[PDB]
Design a protein around this ligand. Structure first.
Ligand SMILES: O=c1nc[nH]c2c1ncn2[C@H]1C[C@H](O)[C@@H](COP(=O)(O)OP(=O)(O)OP(=O)(O)O)O1
Ligand SMILES: NC(=O)c1cccnc1
Ligand SMILES: NC(=O)c1cccnc1
Ligand SMILES: NC(=O)c1cccnc1
Ligand SMILES: NC(=O)c1cccnc1
Ligand SMILES: NC(=O)c1cccnc1
Ligand SMILES: NC(=O)c1cccnc1
Ligand SMILES: [Zn+2]
Lengths: 180, 277, 277, 277, 277, 277, 277
């Protein structure tokens, strides 16, 4: 039986974390739906998301929340990235001026055992594409190009995306600190 | 600090073959029958009173919101029992009960006493489905009534829907049971003197259940037994989602926690009841 | 459905000039002294145990989290009393207590009995500030000890910090008081037979206080008084923020709610105590 | 091993001037009024039932013979109360009560609480004879009724003849008082926490009086006081004819025996009540 | 016949760099924190009992006057611990403790064991002020509790205020420690087998401390060592005002006296603790 | 709170005719023989050492000043014993001993065991004056030596002058007796198990006498006798000038104080010993 | 009911990395060095006295047969120590000690204190073989002697062959250690207050070892800890062949039994000491 449970309602995040942390027999999976607080800071939202997901499932839980801070929007959306891609789908490439396309793709894990909340944060420098390209992946992957690379997260496979994305450095930090 | 399923299985076989294991079934045992738990009742009481169900929840505890419901109008509690009877003991809840793996695994064992705190005929009804016969005991007239010789006695600890005077739901009915003078209270305290219990689908939120296990330790500590002998007769608490505080409170009362797999709640309970056989 | 301050003022004058009004003071009465209420204690117990204070709160009720604290290590409850003594009865809490308008207005009246459920010397200390003298009664040895002739007896209902065996904080200590056999329990039930009470700064969250007012109605209903005469002797519940459910539960127990102005909590209480004079 | 009258007189002055002495009056206190004691009632119940009074006495105790009387016919207990009222509170018993030296010496002192176990208005009637005013408290409606400010409260512990539902005479009424839940029971147990009692004309034959003094020692022994401090607050038992067993049973319960002169029973009691002044 | 500060400084450096020097701190070490010594406690106990402080002093020794205080009334010792906790460990005694030069010079050294006979958190609190961490050991549960790996263990030899059962103040508690069976007694006698001690602010007035150094010489004399080798391991006794008799009594027990400058008591101690570094 | 001479006289006759009363004689019993008490010895030790007798007294207690004397020079303690023998047992102290009314009244009774803590042959010498014969037991060789059949055994508890190794005067000799292993210690603790003692002319200043009566209560309290039966066997403490603290300390140890008339010390003791006959 | 090697291995790692695990080594730890145990000594004492070794064994216990040997002739015990020195610490026992896997696995760990009850230099000699340095402490002069700063102290609990006065072998030497006053006794009782022990190659047959663990529970039971907290600090008893009675006696004293594989005694111990690393 598992001792840690990764809670997400997003079935595309589920197949990413099962691609690397899938063979760990100490990790279970839950699908409880939580409501995030209104703040652009990633550290504040992921810390209030774990206390709201432990209250739902009542087991040691691991939650995940991201950020897409943009220099042209002075850090917007930040942790408000979920309603931007709902509203501005590929017009988000158009509302940003050409010449200052730089942005940061941040991502955070927070595990709560019922007594303590520990936040792990990784981060990837990049720049917003001039137009959306690529088919693979999911939300905002056709618009983000990492630094040095020419391609998007959507144009790369799941092994190649996790060699650039924040989750590929968060697998090893979550496995080491939890013994998965 | 917590038993697993394979660790607790030889401990439950020993108490069952000696005839000293008694199941205690809660509201989570009728959850696969699509019945309300203690939270969906309050969502239904708030709709009748004109409350939003999230605003009604923050004015008091479960006992106190039902006390407020019962005194809102005359005959308001009688209507609730009628509505609960039509919903809890409906024919589609009967049909989900024969194909339920927990109720089949419960009735496959040859119990002698079963305690429940839920108002539905789905624990004795599970015994009728397996060809066995049961005897519901809820009031004083049931205990003095005629039974057969060797029949599993199902003790409806909080009452039955066909005897609406026995249902304890409001706060005043929980305070009336603090005297421990009701016939289900007197039968429970005498069975607790000699038997191990198995809590399935029940969470210790009732302050009269916790008060009975409190006062069994006042007999246990005053009897001045050793460290070895006062810890010999244990009770078992099967729960998917016990927190961090409640398992250590119950270690005082010789209650061990059996951690079940929370991914599938119904199959984890059914494998526990099949491991006793 | 709820008394205001000017409506309840002639009702409190009549019971006070007959000598049949007794104050009952809670944890909100020591809130202007910058002391913890029942929530800031749990935030301090969670820091010692290594919990975050928001995660520790969702594992049980107030009685159950203090029971978990007291059994975490040996002598863990003794340390809490020592720490509370340093922070509740400190010299800067003494200095805030002479200039507090509630404690001055309380001591200006010539009471004979005061009940409190908080562990601090700021209710009898308010009487010493006004030149009056008080008599703290908490344990069996205090009731049989010598007092003076006509001195206000302050009944520490939940215990005092200078007698750490009398403090009821954990869940096992609340269950020990359910027998209603302690000397503060026996004195309360006899004063409730003949006197009106005034609840100031107290919220009915203790299940042993609510159980005493429950069993006074079992004497009231069995005595078969009329509609007029069973509703004659009332108790009063001054509260800024009572909800929608709790005032109707307490109407069963002859407890009327006095709505105070929630903009300034300290001045609303002080105008109530000055209206009794 | 037994106090005399001159030895116990400074001990009773000290408790009286502190306001912590309460008289407890029995059936022997109304013996100079030519009233029946517990034996002449049974001689009168045997005449109604058709028994010889010596044969009726050997079939059970006092509680059990009155239980047999009350169930012999319908309305048989109501008739007894009516007959007792005409005989106990008659006008010639009133006239013997002003010239009685015990009732004059009792009313000369400024008591605050008097307990009696006899069904007659001759203890509060003695206070009305001396110009003082009394307040009879027997039922729940009396405790919540209006009194004056500083008036001696006469607690009719076993009931009054003008409220026939409060009279405890039969065995079933003594068993109903074993729960210690009646309003005279709750008032007695709280006064026993803080006061010395003086038993005059009473013999400990009631198993509910002896059970109250039993459970005050369970508070006294569990509080773990010393040898010196647990023996400090005494009660006093004035009796002409105590045997050899009963004074040593009551030493357990901090009850000292005052030996009165058995040649003249009325003058020995009157000199005790005059020595308190 | 008595060491000075400069003579004893190389003797204390040698035992400290070998890790075989242990401080023993008395009531005079908390004198710059404006706390009572053994004489101002008795002046405070005499005020409670109704004595004049000069008349109360001539009826017995320090142990015997506190024994008389504790048996004057029930719960009289518990109140003293509560009062001492609020006066000894107050916030203004904390503020005098960071700017005290003795407590800074004590915590600057890297000790491993510190013994104290005073009831205050100002010796381990001095170690917390310097960024170091300490471990208070007073009762049996502290010795078996978890500590860290290399942390200075502060042995509260006479007890701590947060564990009121460990405080030895009365005469009966000193006689209970004559068996040398308490966990601080057993730890002291094993550390005395191998280590030099430094007595600072302590005067040998406790007859259980003097009895431990007595029975270490009964091991020393029975082992039949020479004149040279039995005098090798010394203990040190820093005192401003030792008399003419007491330094020669302690030469029997291998205790050397370090004469400090009596003009400024606090600066003389601080220069001794800085000379060890 | 203190027995007089006429009150204690029938209590001492009962224990004497049962053979269960044993006298314990102190230094005040040899005061009419013009001998030094514990203060005039120290005035004589200060003259030898070159001290003024008022300055020598303020450097330590009685045990500690004699320890300082014995280590001032070699053979200094032996000289003191020789000097004491010439002064205490002189021929003019013999002549004052036949005409002493206390020593005549002591020897007139037929004792079986007498304990003394003074170094003089005036207690067994009083028995030789009355024609009786005594047996001095001080060392191990005396207990195993031959006696006669029924002869009063005088136990020199602190030693005798004709056996100078048995004298306990210095502090190191009192610490050697804290093990309670000496033959007078073992004989005292067995006689205390079964007999009442009468302390005459002795003040409880020896911390080894007080420690023996301490540890008899540790047997008394652990045996869990009642309040009545643990207080049955008393000891008696005849003293002209006991203070206000010491009689209440000794009530713990079942020691009652007999107040003698302080105007004439010798005649008050003699009337006590004649009242036993 | 008995730990295995893999179960006890994480329990021993936790106590070792905290520095709170101390080995206790017996006579079975020197069995692979071809040395006598407690039975082959008696076979050698019987040859000297002229007994057959099977007839000499049935006249008393091990302590009593060595007491009979030592008093058979003058200087008979001195010769035994000389003979044991030649055979226990011989050069061929040194050569078996470097290639012994138990002594290599013992010295590979970084201990701070090791207790032994055998008279041979093969426990500190194992530490010298691994390049480490040890400090043998057997007598009073060793504890007060100079050591280095951080060196494993080997406590020869029963004595060493190079100090023949410290060897306890005869019955009179075991009775002299019942006072628990020797320097190895005082050091053991203070280390037992705070540390877990690991008994390797030792069987509890010494009545002074069993008496020390007896009196640690008298401190444990009088401290009134809970069921959970009094069972927290355990000791460990590695034994190939413990019977059926002795493991249940030692559960009283918080001693757990580690069952080792009895087929190869030396390899089972070595795998235990390697699992701690
Ligand atoms: O690494 C990523 N690579 C591509 N897209 C990502 C990533 N990480 C988040 N995203 C998208 C998903 C979602 O549209 C939004 C985060 O919002 P988020 O609240 O976490 O998604 P959710 O509520 O549907 O699932 P969950 O219950 O786990 O929070 O940005
Ligand atoms: N009959 C039930 O399942 C039930 C559920 C919740 C509360 N009471 C009864
Ligand atoms: N003394 C107080 O104010 C207090 C607060 C909370 C709980 N108990 C007491
Ligand atoms: N009223 C009385 O005197 C009386 C006598 C006997 C019994 N009950 C009452
Ligand atoms: N801790 C102290 O200051 C103190 C003072 C007097 C006696 N004991 C302790
Ligand atoms: N022999 C005595 O009287 C005596 C006096 C003083 C001290 N010790 C003994
Ligand atoms: N040194 C040893 O091996 C030994 C053997 C038997 C008894 N004591 C010691
Ligand atoms: Zn989301």
């Amino acid at each position: 039986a598992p001792t840690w449970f990764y809670n997400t309602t997003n079935s595309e995040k589920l197949r990413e974390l099962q691609h690397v942390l899938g063979g760990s027999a100490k990790l279970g999976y839950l699908t409880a739906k939580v409501t995030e607080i209104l703040d652009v800071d990633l550290e504040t939202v992921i810390r209030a998301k774990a206390i709201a997901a432990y209250r739902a499932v009542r087991v040691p839980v691991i939650v995940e929340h991201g950020a897409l801070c943009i220099d042209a929007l002075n850090g917007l959306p930040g942790a408000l990235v979920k309603p931007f891609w709902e509203s501005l789908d590929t017009r988000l490439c158009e509302v940003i001026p050409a010449g200052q396309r730089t942005a940061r793709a941040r991502g955070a894990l927070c595990y709560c055992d019922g007594r303590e909340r520990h936040v792990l944060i990784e981060e990837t420098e990049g720049e917003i594409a001039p137009s959306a390209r690529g088919t693979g992946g999911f939300h905002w992957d056709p618009i983000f190009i990492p630094k040095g690379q020419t391609r998007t997260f959507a144009e790369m496979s799941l092994d190649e995306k996790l060699s650039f994305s924040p989750l590929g450095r968060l697998h090893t930090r979550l496995r080491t600190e939890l013994g998965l | 600090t917590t038993l697993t399923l394979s660790e607790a299985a030889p401990l439950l076989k020993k108490e069952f073959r000696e005839g000293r294991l008694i199941p205690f079934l809660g509201a989570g045992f009728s959850k696969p029958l699509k019945l309300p738990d203690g939270s969906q009742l309050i969502a239904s009481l708030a709709k009748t009173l004109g409350f939003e169900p999230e605003l009604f929840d923050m004015h008091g505890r479960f006992e106190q919101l039902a006390e407020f419901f019962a005194i809102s109008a005359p005959n308001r509690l009688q209507r609730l029992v009628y509505e609960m009877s039509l919903s809890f003991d409906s024919a589609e809840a009967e049909a989900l009960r024969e194909k339920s793996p927990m109720h089949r695994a419960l009735a496959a064992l040859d119990w002698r006493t079963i305690y429940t705190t839920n108002y539905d005929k789905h624990v004795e009804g599970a015994l009728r489905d397996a060809g066995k016969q049961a005897a519901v005991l809820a009031s004083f007239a049931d205990f003095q009534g005629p039974r057969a010789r060797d029949v599993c006695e199902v003790i409806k600890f909080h009452g039955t829907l066909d005897q609406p005077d026995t249902i304890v739901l409001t706060e005043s009915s929980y305070f009336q049971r603090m005297a421990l003078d009701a016939p289900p209270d007197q039968r429970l305290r005498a069975d607790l003197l000699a038997n191990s219990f198995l809590f399935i689908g029940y969470s210790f939120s009732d302050t009269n259940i916790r008060y009975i296990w409190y006062r069994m330790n006042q007999l246990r500590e005053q009897s001045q037994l050793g460290v070895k002998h006062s810890q010999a007769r244990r009770c078992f608490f099967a729960t998917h989602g016990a927190g961090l505080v409640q398992p250590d409170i119950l270690q005082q009362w010789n209650i061990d926690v059996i951690q079940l797999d929370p991914t599938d709640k119904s199959a984890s309970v059914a494998r526990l009841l099949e491991s006793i056989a």
